[PDB]
């Protein structure tokens, strides 16, 4: 959880995020997620804002990004098969 919150801070450093983005909450919504998924969550979160012609990414955009990346794209997740290998 501490590491995931740190990766969120790294990838959302240069973003145009809102005031109170609960990055600890976002790290909690993806328990077993690679840093690659976290970067995509940040990219899709700002991608929803571009979709709505908005210059600032809100916390809802990150919540939708987590659903699209962590949840919707969990069918293609390489994590479950590769933890057995590692």
């Amino acid at each position: 959880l501490e590491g995931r919150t740190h990766i969120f801070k790294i990838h959302a450093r240069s973003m145009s995020v809102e005031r109170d983005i609960r990055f600890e909450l976002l790290a909690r919504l993806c328990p077993n997620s690679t840093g690659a998924e976290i970067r995509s969550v940040c990219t899709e979160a700002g991608m929803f804002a571009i979709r709505a012609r908005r210059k600032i990414a809100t916390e809802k955009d990150f919540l939708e990004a987590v659903n699209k990346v962590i949840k919707s794209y969990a069918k293609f997740s390489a994590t479950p098969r590769y933890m057995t290998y590692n």
Partner: protein, 251 residues
């Protein structure tokens, strides 16, 4: 004896390719037809006017041997004819390199001054003097037949209007292959790099290739198409070698 030491950092060529060379005039802003642009445009012209007068004066009193057409003629004499085509095996020093002719015989020859030294890389096709085998030029490699296969020279005639019902699919694919190029500011003002890769999946006949064809029709970027079955090669390592070369053409 001590081994020669290069002054150039590394053994690879310069990354920049196909630039404006010395025609890289300063970018004058704004593009609006105003006096400031006129003042900047005159400013560039003023220096060129100085440049024209300065260069002419030197060449006027330059010796008859040292002239722009004479030195070019002397270059051809130094290069000679025929001009052998070899392979750069190693850059021993700034002005020395190991080259191999087509017969497989390697030579330790000298790179002459007029050679474009930043196009020199190991494995590149070098031009050598017929007699002394000295490096006298670099052959601009012709487009590989492998390059022509990937490149779609003419954009397909299928547009987005020819696709029905894939409104979300077009919107998602546009935002990773089309929007980042047409309007890159949207991603920079947000601080996000565009979605890196995209995969189109579904039942056969659902329009996966069609949307890619529509992407290729309205793209300013080079479009390389390779079927996955084309990555299965008849020899070991060739498949990995081909995937490596495909993204090298993309670079």
């Amino acid at each position: 004896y001590e081994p020669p030491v290069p002054t150039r950092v590394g053994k690879k060529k310069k990354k920049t390719k196909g630039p404006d060379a010395a025609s890289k005039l300063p970018l004058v802003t704004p593009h609006t037809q105003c006096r400031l642009k006129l003042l900047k445009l005159e400013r560039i012209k003023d220096y060129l006017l100085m440049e024209e007068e300065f260069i002419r004066n030197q060449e006027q009193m330059k010796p008859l041997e040292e002239k722009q057409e004479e030195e070019r003629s002397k270059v051809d004499d130094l290069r000679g004819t025929p001009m052998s085509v070899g392979t750069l095996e190693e850059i021993i020093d700034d002005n020395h390199a190991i080259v191999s002719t087509s017969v497989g015989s390697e030579h330790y020859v000298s790179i002459l001054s007029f050679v474009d030294k930043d196009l020199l890389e190991p494995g590149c096709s070098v031009l050598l003097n017929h007699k002394v085998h000295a490096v006298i030029g670099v052959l601009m490699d012709d487009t590989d037949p492998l390059v022509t296969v990937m490149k779609v020279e003419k954009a397909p005639q299928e547009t987005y209007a020819d696709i029905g019902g894939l409104d979300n699919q077009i919107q998602e694919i546009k935002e990773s292959v089309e929007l980042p190029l047409t309007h890159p500011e949207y991603y920079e003002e947000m601080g996000i790099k565009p979605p890196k890769g995209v995969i189109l999946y579904g039942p056969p006949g659902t329009g996966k290739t069609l949307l890619a064809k529509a992407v290729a029709n309205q793209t300013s970027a080079t479009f390389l198409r390779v079927v996955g079955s084309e990555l299965i090669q008849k020899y070991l390592g060739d498949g990995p070698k081909l995937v490596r070369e495909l993204f090298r053409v993309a670079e």
